[PDB]
Write a protein that binds this ligand. Sequence first.
Ligand SMILES: Cc1cc2cc(C(=O)N(Cc3ccc(C(F)(F)F)cn3)[C@H](C)c3ncccn3)ccc2nc1N
Ligand SMILES: CSC[C@H]1O[C@@H](n2cnc3c(N)ncnc32)[C@H](O)[C@@H]1O
Lengths: 625, 308
Amino acid sequence: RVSSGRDLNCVPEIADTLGAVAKQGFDFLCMPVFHPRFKREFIQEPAKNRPGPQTRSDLLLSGRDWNTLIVGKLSPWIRPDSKVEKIRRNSEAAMLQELNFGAYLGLPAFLLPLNQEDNTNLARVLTNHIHTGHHSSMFWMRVPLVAPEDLRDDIIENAPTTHTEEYSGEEKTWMWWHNFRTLCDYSKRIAVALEIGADLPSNHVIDRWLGEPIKAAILPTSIFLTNKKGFPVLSKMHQRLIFRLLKLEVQFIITGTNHHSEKEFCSYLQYLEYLSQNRPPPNAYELFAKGYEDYLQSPLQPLMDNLESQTYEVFEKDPIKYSQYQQAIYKCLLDRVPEEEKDTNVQVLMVLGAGRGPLVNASLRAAKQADRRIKLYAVEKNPNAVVTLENWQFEEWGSQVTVVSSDMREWVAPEKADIIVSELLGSFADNELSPECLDGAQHFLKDDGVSIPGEYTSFLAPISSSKLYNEVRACREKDRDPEAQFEMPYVVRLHNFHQLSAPQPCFTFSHPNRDPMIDNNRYCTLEFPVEVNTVLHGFAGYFETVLYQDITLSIRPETHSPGMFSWFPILFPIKQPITVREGQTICVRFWRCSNSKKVWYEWAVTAPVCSAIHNPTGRSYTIGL
Amino acid sequence: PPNAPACMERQLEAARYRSDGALLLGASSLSGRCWAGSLWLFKDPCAAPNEGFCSAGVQTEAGVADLTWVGERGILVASDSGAVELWELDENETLIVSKFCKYEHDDIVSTVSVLSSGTQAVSGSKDICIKVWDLAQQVVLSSYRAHAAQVTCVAASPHKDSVFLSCSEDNRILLWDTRCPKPASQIGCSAPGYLPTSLAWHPQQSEVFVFGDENGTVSLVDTKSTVLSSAVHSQCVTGLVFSPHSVPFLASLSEDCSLAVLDSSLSELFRSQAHRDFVRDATWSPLNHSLLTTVGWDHQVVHHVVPT
Ligand SMILES: Cc1cc2cc(C(=O)N(Cc3ccc(C(F)(F)F)cn3)[C@H](C)c3ncccn3)ccc2nc1N
Ligand SMILES: CSC[C@H]1O[C@@H](n2cnc3c(N)ncnc32)[C@H](O)[C@@H]1O
């Protein structure tokens, strides 16, 4: 189902127009709240004292109707950045008047145009209005993919249209929006109404708008093609754009008059609904992760904290992750015990961080599948999960499993392990301190013992996402550093963002660690070629792990384990957005730091410009040992 | 009168004298519950805008942004709805009947002008577009997107069927000639000035026209020339209308609520602050060439005696 609105600049009489618009199938209506031609004077007499009502009454609709069906529109004669001072003054006052009437009505959204380069005074008046009282309604900036000057007909004989490619110039409307929102200081109430044109620009021009807060897409009727039966349709290129806007779940707006007058006007809407039901149906990942798009969460710390019951339940809903673990244990058992020794050799498996037992069960299933004999220790320091484990052991597992309520770094094992199995990995691999945990459990692993996983590697990638930067920003808390929210990572299902370069490996660990001197501190320098103009807001983090040999798990996009949804990516933000131009290299530097009580990350951008070093000494974020 | 609304809307938008002296009126309601328009005929101009004394009346679907006579019984209308409308007086000249209503513009139609061939007309709109109309077949023959902002004014050449002017908020004054493969030519001052808001061809000299800007300046331009201007108004110049004299005068009207009458050198001869709101149109009587009828948003129809 598609959420759709009708844009009109002519409403003789609201009740009739709203009814016809509702019949056609539209969910809301963009309309003027003052008559678009009703230019008003505020300074000079006698036009300043024009009598009569300035617009029509709020009583014509119910509060609920104003609140949910009407999107306001700034009058087209209001030009706050005019060169004529008298037009500037009048436009400032009229803009405030129309915006205040919108707030008076409780409108959910208000459309304002970005139709030229210089909108500084427009930005200041809007910002002054946003900071007048506390309101939550949205301001949709109407900005086209292609500027009006750049798509006009080549019909002026002494002013021919440019036929020479201007890579940056064809991106000019993104700069209009970027400058405008920067003046307004990334106000959460200001979003983009992207106006689509008859001719789409090159892919890089569209691609600027990736990660931008697009709330609406405006489709003029003049961009629709005309099929065999005369129904309005779209080009192959426009369909690709609609599909990829449908993933952001924007609202679609139909503007312009009917140009398929043989057909009914609703048909424009009907084609959008047609396209929306023929997109690829939700995969398993999308079905489960619904609602989590760009939702920020603090990373779980299963070592420092005792996880709740429903957190383990979420861990357990992923059959792919544990069958992979089963397959890894299965292959190791066959490698370790030969066919001839299968009844005499009992392998000692220890699950280090057993949780509620999913790894224990997968180890039992792998033993039967390999038809080999295993002895199990289930080590778990969370005494609440040990309740689950000991009820399992008594009722079902029996004496084959020995539940151990201890920290794996302190437990004095009665014997050594053939295999240690663990799921101590976070979204950024080592960010739950899996290296420190397995390092301390290493002594009771046999000299030829196997650790599952045997290895894991984190990956970073620079991302652009004004939306995500705006949500970190909103995480400022009382009674702490006012910029601390930028100096900590978040577990988040990255959705509305642009990846600026391919993920590159960051930190890697292997187990067991045969090195005589073990140091889990790390320092890594990454250079990301960026072949686009953009704005850097942070770094997406992923990981890959080798459970055993060729059995792997990955959330790295280009090697993502198909169907597994256990881990969302992690996001490392930066305090200040950084402009990056095409051909420039982003250089980021990450440190893994530690003392005897805490582990943390520090990071800094060093090219094309330097950022501040983030989280020095773990002042804003640490991971408890 | 029958089929005529009891009261016309307050915001008077247009006033055009016919050859016989009857007054065409266009008006729109720009506030209140209903935003529509209406068209009126006043064979008695001194009775305007009183509805009871009108010769004919009809109300339109939306507001009237601009209109113009088509011959002597036709009325071409630029509508808020995005439509160009043609209305025709009946043989009785007591009704105003809809000939065609075509929704071809995607925004408000802001300006319309009948070409000298009498069978074609040009319209400009807030949708940046300009269209050439064939009034007979009721179709758009050409749709031009030369400008980069809303089109403020289009004005057909007096005697060249294929030539007309246009001016937009993109700061372009375009001279059009549909006989050319690229029909538009950007003319005017090479250096950018204030946005042009109104246009008027000189009635005698095929190469000469005047234009007003958003800053109150009125400028006399010879296209074949190789500029004369005067700061006439304190706000936007809304329109410019040449008198029907052999050596014509120039009526300029503005949002400063004043009317001015200029001679050939843009020197001022007359000035009227009779209106208490925006002055929207001005039309010279063909019967008495020193009468100038202005209308405005104050709902006034003022009959000026112009010292000629
Ligand atoms: C064994 C294990 C699992 C881990 C999972 C995550 C993680 O990605 N998530 C967010 C999340 C992923 C998927 C879904 C859905 F809907 F698809 F099932 C819902 N939520 C968890 C649940 C989370 N919950 C609250 C706060 C932060 N993280 C991160 C680290 C993990 N470490 C581990 N050792
Ligand atoms: C299934 S999530 C990882 C599990 O390992 C447990 N765990 C993490 N660190 C240790 C540790 N050092 N010793 C024992 N259990 C641990 C956590 O409590 C969690 O249930």
